[PDB]
């Protein structure tokens, strides 16, 4: 029919409750809080329209193409339990709307402009159903869980890491000294802090030289393969790649990147470089809580976690539950499975809004880090299982006897938990006894247990299901 200029409600075209989703569609679950007076169907339609094909007034150029084929569509709205003005609006986006292999493009559409609409008071993207037809266009992890364990010859227990401290301010030579002492005591890894890039107090290439010396000295002394995640995060892509190239030259096993502060375009490039050069890639999620902490607005971490498995990383931090940073238990178990498993069925009790099928994309190893210590070892082993990296920065360099004893305490605590679990002990109920029993064998563990016995982080989480 004729082109009729002017404004009409988005719901006339973009609210389609009769639509049956296609297995190729990307599905989004948005928690939407409309302004007073805006019907939920119009709020959901506006979000679908303005993240896909529509604008605020009718345009004649819609007649040159097929909105039936390309429009995003809000196909279901459900009120949120306990809220008087919040809804989960479900939006389906045709596969053709997205650039293959580009997380950047996916986010640009789905979360590019709709969060600022005047007609909404708040908007949070809770989950995305990434269809196999779209995920197969991504490389994903450079190596993945199985391959990483096979490269490092490490099996049967969580991996153990440690961020060097103070966060900033140490020289390159002191960084390598701290690294050597930690690795020789029993940790598999140490790492640059997320904000250690290249600075006046320590330039990156000097750090890379001394940390390589440290990795190889501790590996020769212990006979176990060691690594120190060298940070490639940088101000430009050319500097990022320059840093990764020198880690490749040094022959080390693993580098790291801050995927959100460096960004997805850079991260995806680095993941390809790491795949082509045999480097494991540890991903730090710096800045995620700016986006994912509040229930009413932002993006839940599970979406950021799926996006990193697509863009690519071999490890990603996923919280500790029991440490210094927030991480509600059930929602954490839900995204840990989204990061590691091949097929995760819908389970709203764990915040999984959609069934997610990864069609053999490799899994990412979740990393628990932040305010944890030896007494947490049973709980961490129980929550995450063997496919995880448990990192103790303050929990190693804060040991009263120094780094090597601090590393030994954590390695002994972890091995005692693994042995007990394998023999059939209940880590969730006997953890303190298992740790105390190992104190008999390990003076280093006994000292760590004494210093941190009264330390617990118990605060109500801000985000609850």
């Amino acid at each position: 029919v004729g082109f009729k200029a002017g404004v009409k409600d988005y719901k006339l075209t973009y609210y389609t409750p009769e639509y049956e989703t296609k297995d190729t569609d990307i599905l989004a679950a948005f928690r939407v809080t409309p302004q007073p007076g805006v019907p939920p169907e119009e709020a959901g339609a506006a979000v679908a329209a303005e993240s896909s094909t529509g604008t605020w007034t009718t345009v004649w150029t819609d007649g040159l193409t097929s909105l039936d084929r390309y429009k995003g569509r809000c196909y279901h709205i459900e009120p949120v339990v306990g809220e008087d003005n919040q809804y989960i609006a479900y939006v389906a986006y045709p596969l053709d709307l997205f650039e293959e292999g580009s997380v950047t493009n996916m986010f640009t559409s789905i979360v590019g402009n709709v969060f600022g609409f005047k007609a909404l008071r708040a908007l949070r993207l809770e989950d995305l159903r990434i269809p196999p037809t779209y995920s197969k266009t991504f490389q994903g992890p450079p190596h993945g869980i199985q391959v990483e364990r096979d490269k490092l010859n490490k099996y049967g227990r969580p991996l153990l890491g440690c961020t060097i401290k103070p966060k900033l301010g140490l020289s390159a030579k002191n960084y390598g000294r701290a690294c050597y002492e930690c690795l020789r005591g029993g940790l598999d890894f140490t790492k640059d802090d997320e904000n250690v890039n290249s600075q006046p107090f320590m330039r990156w290439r000097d750090r890379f030289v001394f940390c390589a010396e440290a990795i190889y000295k501790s590996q020769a002394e212990t006979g176990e393969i060691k690594g120190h995640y060298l940070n490639a995060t940088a101000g430009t892509c050319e500097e990022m790649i320059k840093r990764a190239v020198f880690a490749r030259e040094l022959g080390v096993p693993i580098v790291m990147h801050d995927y959100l502060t460096g960004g997805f375009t850079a991260n995806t490039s680095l993941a390809h470089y790491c795949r082509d050069n045999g480097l494991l890639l540890h991903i730090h999620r710096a800045m995620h809580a700016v986006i994912d902490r509040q229930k009413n607005h932002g993006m839940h971490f599970r979406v950021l976690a799926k996006a990193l498995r697509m863009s690519g990383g071999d490890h990603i931090h996923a919280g500790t539950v029991v440490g210094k940073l927030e991480g509600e238990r059930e929602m954490t178990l839900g995204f840990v499975d989204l990061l590691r498993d091949d097929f995760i069925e819908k389970d709203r009790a764990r915040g999984i809004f959609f069934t997610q099928d990864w069609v053999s994309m490799p899994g990412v190893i979740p990393v628990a880090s932040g305010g944890i210590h030896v007494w947490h070892m049973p709980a961490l082993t129980e929550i995450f299982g063997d496919d995880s990296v448990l990192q103790f920065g303050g929990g190693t360099l804060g040991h009263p006897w120094g780094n090597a004893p601090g590393a030994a305490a954590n390695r002994v605590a972890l091995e005692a938990c693994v042995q007990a679990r394998n023999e059939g002990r209940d880590l969730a109920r006997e953890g303190n006894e298992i740790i105390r029993s190992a104190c008999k064998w390990s003076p280093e563990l006994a000292a760590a247990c004494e210093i941190w016995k009264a330390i617990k982080f118990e605060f109500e989480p801000v985000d609850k299901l």
């Binding site: 096979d150 176990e224 023999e423």
Partner: protein
């Protein structure tokens, strides 16, 4: 304040920071492997550690493979049988390290691996 030793304490990955495993300790790890429905296998080597002789590129190390003792014990339901093979391997190679591994063929990865015998003086 104790200083962590710098020699004579070389390690062998999982369980090597605990006291030496007794025969009952080894049995319990093998029972865990079998109840979990994993396949046990023994491997052995006269060289106990990795090194880098042929290449130094990322992720390349020599010494990660050890030699397979016979074949994986597909269909094994008795931990005692695994111990009998360990005894046969030590009798055949008393100067070799012997490790027991267990794998899941669905995920295709080793889920457990530990040293079960070290030669005299190692």
């Amino acid at each position: 304040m104790q200083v962590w030793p710098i020699e004579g304490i070389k390690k062998f990955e999982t369980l090597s920071y605990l006291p030496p495993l007794t025969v009952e300790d080894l049995l319990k790890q093998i029972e865990y492997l079998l109840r979990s429905k994993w396949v046990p296998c023994l491997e052995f080597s006269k060289v106990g550690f990795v090194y880098r002789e042929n290449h130094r590129s990322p992720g390349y190390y020599d010494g990660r493979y050890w030699t397979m003792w016979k074949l994986p014990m597909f269909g094994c339901t008795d931990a005692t049988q695994v111990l009998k093979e360990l005894e046969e391997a030590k009798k055949a190679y008393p100067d070799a390290f012997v490790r027991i591994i267990g794998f899941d063929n669905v995920r295709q990865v080793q889920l457990i691996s530990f040293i079960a015998y070290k030669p005299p003086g190692c």
